[PDB]
Amino acid sequence: SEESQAFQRQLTALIGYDVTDVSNVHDDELEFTRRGLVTPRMAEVASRDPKLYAMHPWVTSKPLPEYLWKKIANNCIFIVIHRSTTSQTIKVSPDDTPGAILQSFFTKMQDFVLRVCGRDEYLVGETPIKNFQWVRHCLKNGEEIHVVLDTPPDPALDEVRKECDRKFRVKIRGIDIPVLPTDLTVFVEANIQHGQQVLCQRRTSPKPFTEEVLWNVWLEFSIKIKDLPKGALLNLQIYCGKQLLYYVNLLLIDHRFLLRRGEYVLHMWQISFNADKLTSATNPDKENSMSISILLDNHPIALPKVRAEMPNQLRKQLEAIIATDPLNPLTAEDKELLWHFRYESLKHPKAYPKLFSSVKWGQQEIVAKTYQLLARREVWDQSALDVGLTMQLLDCNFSDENVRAIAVQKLESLEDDDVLHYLLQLVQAVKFEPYHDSALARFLLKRGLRNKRIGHFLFWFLRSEIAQSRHYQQRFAVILEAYLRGCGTAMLHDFTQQVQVIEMLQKVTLDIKSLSAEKYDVSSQVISQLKQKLENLQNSQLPESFRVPYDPGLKAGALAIEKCKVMASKKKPLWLEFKCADPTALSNETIGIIFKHGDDLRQDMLILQILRIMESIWETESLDLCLLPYGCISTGDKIGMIEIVKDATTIAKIQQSTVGNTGFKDEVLNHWLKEKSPTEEKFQAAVERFVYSCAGYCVATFVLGIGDRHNDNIMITETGNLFHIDFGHLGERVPFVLTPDFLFVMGTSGKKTSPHFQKFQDICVKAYLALRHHTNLLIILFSMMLMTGMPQLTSKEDIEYIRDALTVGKNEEDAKKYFLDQIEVCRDKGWTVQFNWFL
Numbered sequence: 020s021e022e023s024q025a026f027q028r029q030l031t032a033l034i035g036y037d038v039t040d041v042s043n044v045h046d047d048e049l050e051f052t053r054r055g056l057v058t059p060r061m062a063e064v065a066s067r068d069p070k071l072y073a074m075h076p077w078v079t080s081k082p083l084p085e086y087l088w089k090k091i092a093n094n095c096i097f098i099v100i101h102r103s104t105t106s107q108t109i110k111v112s113p114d115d116t117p118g119a120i121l122q123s124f125f126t127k128m129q130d131f132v133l134r135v136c137g138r139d140e141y142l143v144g145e146t147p148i149k150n151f152q153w154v155r156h157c158l159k160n161g162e163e164i165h166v167v168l169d170t171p172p173d174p175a176l177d178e179v180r181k182e183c184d185r186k187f188r189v190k191i192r193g194i195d196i197p198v199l200p201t202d203l204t205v206f207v208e209a210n211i212q213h214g215q216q217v218l219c220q221r222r223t224s225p226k227p228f229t230e231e232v233l234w235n236v237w238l239e240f241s242i243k244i245k246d247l248p249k250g251a252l253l254n255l256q257i258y259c260g261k262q263l264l265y266y267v268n269l270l271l272i273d274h275r276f277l278l279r280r281g282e283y284v285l286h287m288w289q290i291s292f293n294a295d296k297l298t299s300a301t302n303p304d305k306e307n308s309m310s311i312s313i314l315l316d317n318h319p320i321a322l323p324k325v326r327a328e329m330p331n332q333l334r335k336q337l338e339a340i341i342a343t344d345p346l347n348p349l350t351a352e353d354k355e356l357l358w359h360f361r362y363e364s365l366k367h368p369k370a371y372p373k374l375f376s377s378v379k380w381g382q383q384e385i386v387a388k389t390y391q392l393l394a395r396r397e398v399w400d401q402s403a404l405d406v407g408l409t410m411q412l413l414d415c416n417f418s419d420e421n422v423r424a425i426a427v428q429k430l431e432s433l434e435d436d437d438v439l440h441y442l443l444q445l446v447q448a449v450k451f452e453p454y455h456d457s458a459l460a461r462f463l464l465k466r467g468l469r470n471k472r473i474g475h476f477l478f479w480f481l482r483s484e485i486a487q488s489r490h491y492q493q494r495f496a497v498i499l500e501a502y503l504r505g506c507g508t509a510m511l512h513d514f515t516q517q518v519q520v521i522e523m524l525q526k527v528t529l530d531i532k533s534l535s536a537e538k539y540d541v542s543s544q545v546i547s548q549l550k551q552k553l554e555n556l557q558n559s560q561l562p563e564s565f566r567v568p569y570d571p572g573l574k575a576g577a578l579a580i581e582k583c584k585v586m587a588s589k590k591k592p593l594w595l596e597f598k599c600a601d602p603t604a605l606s607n608e609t610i611g612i613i614f615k616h617g618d619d620l621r622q623d624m625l626i627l628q629i630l631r632i633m634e635s636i637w638e639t640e641s642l643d644l645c646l647l648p649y650g651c652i653s654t655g656d657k658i659g660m661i662e663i664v665k666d667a668t669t670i671a672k673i674q675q676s677t678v679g680n681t682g683f684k685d686e687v688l689n690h691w692l693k694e695k696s697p698t699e700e701k702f703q704a705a706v707e708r709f710v711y712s713c714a715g716y717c718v719a720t721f722v723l724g725i726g727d728r729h730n731d732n733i734m735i736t737e738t739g740n741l742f743h744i745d746f747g748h749l750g751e752r753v754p755f756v757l758t759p760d761f762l763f764v765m766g767t768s769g770k771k772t773s774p775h776f777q778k779f780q781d782i783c784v785k786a787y788l789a790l791r792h793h794t795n796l797l798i799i800l801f802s803m804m805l806m807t808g809m810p811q812l813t814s815k816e817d818i819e820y821i822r823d824a825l826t827v828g829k830n831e832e833d834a835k836k837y838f839l840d841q842i843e844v845c846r847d848k849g850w851t852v853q854f855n856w857f858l
Contacts, residue, residue, distance in 0.1 A: 033511070033518060034482070034485060035486045036493070038497050043302070043303040045284075045285065048274050048455050049493055051456070052455040052456040053500065060505040061182065064468060070171065072177060072469075072471065073174040073176070075141070075471035076151070078151055079152060079155075084638050084641055096110070097110060097111070097163065098164045099163055099164060101166065102167065107124070107128070109123060113148065113149035114147045116145060117133060117142050118143070131170065132169065133167075133168065135166055136166060137601040137604030137605055138573060138574075138601065139566070140153050143171075177508070179507060180508065185244055186239055186244075187240045187244045189237075189240075190236065191209065191223055191234050191311070192233065192235055193234055193312060195310050203228050203259050204225050205258060207223045207311065209253065210253075211247070211271070211381070212418075213252070214376075214416050215415050219240040221238040244278065246383045248419065250270070250453040250454070252299070255267050255285070255313070263290055266296060267288065267302075269283065269299065270453065270454070280316060280317065282312070285301050285313070286302040286308045293805075293812050294451065295490040295491075298490040298491060302489065337356055337357070340356065341369055344822060344827050349373060349376055358377045358378070365398060371399070371412065372417075375422050376417075380418075386419075393425065404429055404433070406441060407799055409430060410426075410441075410803070412425070414448065414451055418453050420453075423452070423459065424458045431462070435466070435469075439473055441632070443624060444628065445459065446484075449494065455493075455497060455498075464498065471510065474510065479654075481495045486655045486656070487656045517565045517568060520562060520565045521568065521660065527552050528592070528614045528616055528658065531549055531591060539589070550580055553595075563600065564577075568660060569649075569651060569652045569660065573599065574600040575600060576598045578597055592616070596609040597612070613660065613662075613663055614659075614660055615661065618747045620654075620658070622748070632800065636793050640789045642789060645708055646712070646716065647742035649661065649664055650662035664736060669731050670734060674687055674730065677690070681854075688761065689763050692705050692706065695737040701738075705738050706765075708738060708740055709740070709741055709764055710764075710775055711782060712742065713761055714779055714782040714783045717783060718790065720756075726754050728755075730756075733756060751848070752852065759850060762776065765779055770846050783839075784835045787838045791826070794827060798825070802818045
């Protein structure tokens with residue numbers, strides 16, 4: 020139907036790409052994948068409870084941390100129930116089910132439900148109220164729980180629209196480029212890879228690098244055709260430099276298990292390790308990109324389906340190897356050991372990554388034995404879920420579908436709250452998949468379609484890449500389409516509002532950027548120019564309201580144009596403010612959002628996420644370092660939005676406000692806090708909060724290798740919560756930022772002591788070692804982060820930093836000592852590094 024034609028047109032607009040396009044393809048994998056995702060979608064759609072899906076309660080099964088029970092030493096919790104001008108205050112017990120307090124209400128005073136005031140957040144479903152995230156959020160922030168009694172959302176609104184033993188060889192015909200301007204020479208390198216491991220390599224003779232270079236030469240490999248593993252890539256690379264200029268990959272076995280065959284003309288990617296180098300997609304730009312032509316002329320297949328010792332010491336060698344971190348390599352010895360004692364290895368879940376890296380994927384018989392091994396997976400299937408281990412089997416080192424699937428199998432058992440914690444990283448992992456359709460892609464579909472909060476962020480995480488990654492936009496686009504076709508008309512409506520809004524603000528942001536980037540000042544002309552442009556949108560163009568992308572529970576209404584402006588910084592980001600479109604809101608406070616161009620916010624997203632992960636880690640040990648991972652969503656190339664934290668200022672601005680400019684007085688910070696503090700109570704609270712938050716970010720920032728900072732890049736709220744920002748990496752050195760002013764707040768100085776500083780040192784050590792208790796998880800998150808977003812990755816030194824930072828190996832005692840020394844290095848440096856941040 021044209022109705023279908025228009026629909027697909029609406030989908031294209033939400034996605035930012037066209038899955039019906041075939042301009043940059045050489046086979047039907049994408050189309051095959053669209054069709055293949057149909058079943059996964061429909062099966063989850065039909066499976067989800069219409070009522071719970073509409074209300075998406077946000078719950079956790081994790082225990083209430085010790086530091087939160089402190090605020091409840093009476094087994095009673097106060098919920099403020101509203102209904103217009105009314106507002107009671109029903110006392111409740113932490114294990115009181117929701118529906119069983121509306122009963123300690125209705126009767127204490129029925130087709131209703133408890134909804135948070137001013138938010139699209141509901142407190143329903145059979146769950147202790149203490150297990151609801153919003154309730155833990157309020158408690159952790161000493162806020163009161165205000166709810167409004169109203170009618171459940173109509174699930175009718177989520178309606179889904181009806182729907183050979185020869186040696187392998189490859190002939191390199193030649194390369195061609197429109198124009199490729201000191202001259203030099205070139206050659207072609209054809210590699211057979213699997214899980215980033217060259218099984219075979221062949222090269223051509225060095226030749227003249229001209230707009231057209233031919234060889235018409237067969238490159239014969241030693242490996243046999245019926246030995247090629249499913250998921251093996253034929254990697255073609257061009258070398259010039261009188262080194263690597265262009266690369267392109269072709270899956271040797273397709274999505275149907277067939278051996279690739281025929282003529283191919285592949286448009287390559289130019290180099291300006293990482294995930295982009297592994298893509299099966301070809302450069303879309305067929306007009307001004309390099310291309311290579313090859314000939315392939317050569318029947319997949321299939322699947323069906325111990326006793327002895329492990330001498331004392333050899334077992335000791337095995338356990339030693341197993342205990343090493345994910346970055347500790349594997350000697351051929353290690354590999355042969357792991358493999359020979361295959362069945363002993365299978366009894367240790369942590370041995371799995373090392374084990375499979377020990378498999379000779381280029382040997383049919385061996386791989387065959389591997390599957391046989393995974394057949395008896397009893398131990399693995401019964402192991403306690405380890406996200407760190409699971410993620411390792413999903414990274415660039417594993418290309419085998421069955422190996423990766425057991426990883427996904429393990430993810431299946433994660434509760435929605437945990438999926439949210441790792442969603443960005445799981446989405447990024449899709450880049451390591453050899454085929455578009457994959458167990459991991461289907462898992463993201465299932466979970467997204469099953470819960471609205473996960474589906475919302477999945478949308479934006481996917482759109483973020485589809486809008487700026489030529490290497491993966493196609494794959495992600497198909498997966499996003501699949502999701503949109505099953506999320507519901509309601510959500511489709513919401514995404515439509517959100518996209519039109521951010522797409523308008525992006526235009527403004529950029530145009531204003533042009534009338535600026537003049538050298539700072541930010542003219543009134545430029546601000547006048549802004550207000551005029553916003554005025555235009557404020558009319559029949561900017562929807563009445565829209566959900567805040569990084570905080571789906573919040574609905575933003577009309578722009579407070581009078582409060583909007585252009586910030587006085589290198590980049591000229593917009594500082595917008597909106598009124599909350601929710602009357603039941605508990606305030607008149609506007610929603611502040613910063614729209615900026617100039618920075619790659621994909622990096623910021625990644626760090627902010629690992630920051631939340633570090634929080635959950637600290638929780639599992641009763642710690643609360645008070646981090647502050649504000650919302651941030653990359654919406655396009657060097658552009659995106661950021662949440663405006665209320666009542667906070669840059670530590671640089673605090674300094675400038677007193678010294679005027681440059682310096683650097685030690686008490687400025689303490690003054691500021693006191694002045695922003697009225698009651699003495701609040702401040703002795705704020706200084707406390709500053710000690711925790713400072714510790715948190717010093718530890719966090721040190722582990723991630725981004726501690727050496729810049730005063731203008733770290734802020735503080737009037738309530739004492741410190742927090743870094745901008746992760747744009749303009750960064751002698753220092754492990755982190757613990758300058759004199761910070762110390763002054765802690766009450767010490769000039770290298771001395773104080774209750775606090777000692778409270779600070781105590782918190783840091785506890786936090787540091789608590790992270791070391793998840794060394795593997797962090798190591799794997801760190802390296803994935805570096806490969807999918809910080810395109811500045813030496814598959815060695817860079818990734819290795821976190822090993823050293825986590826002080827891998829050594830013991831707890833030497834670890835604690837190690838960090839305390841770092842704290843000292845900051846003390847010896849004082850203001851030197853800070854000051855040096857200008858030359």
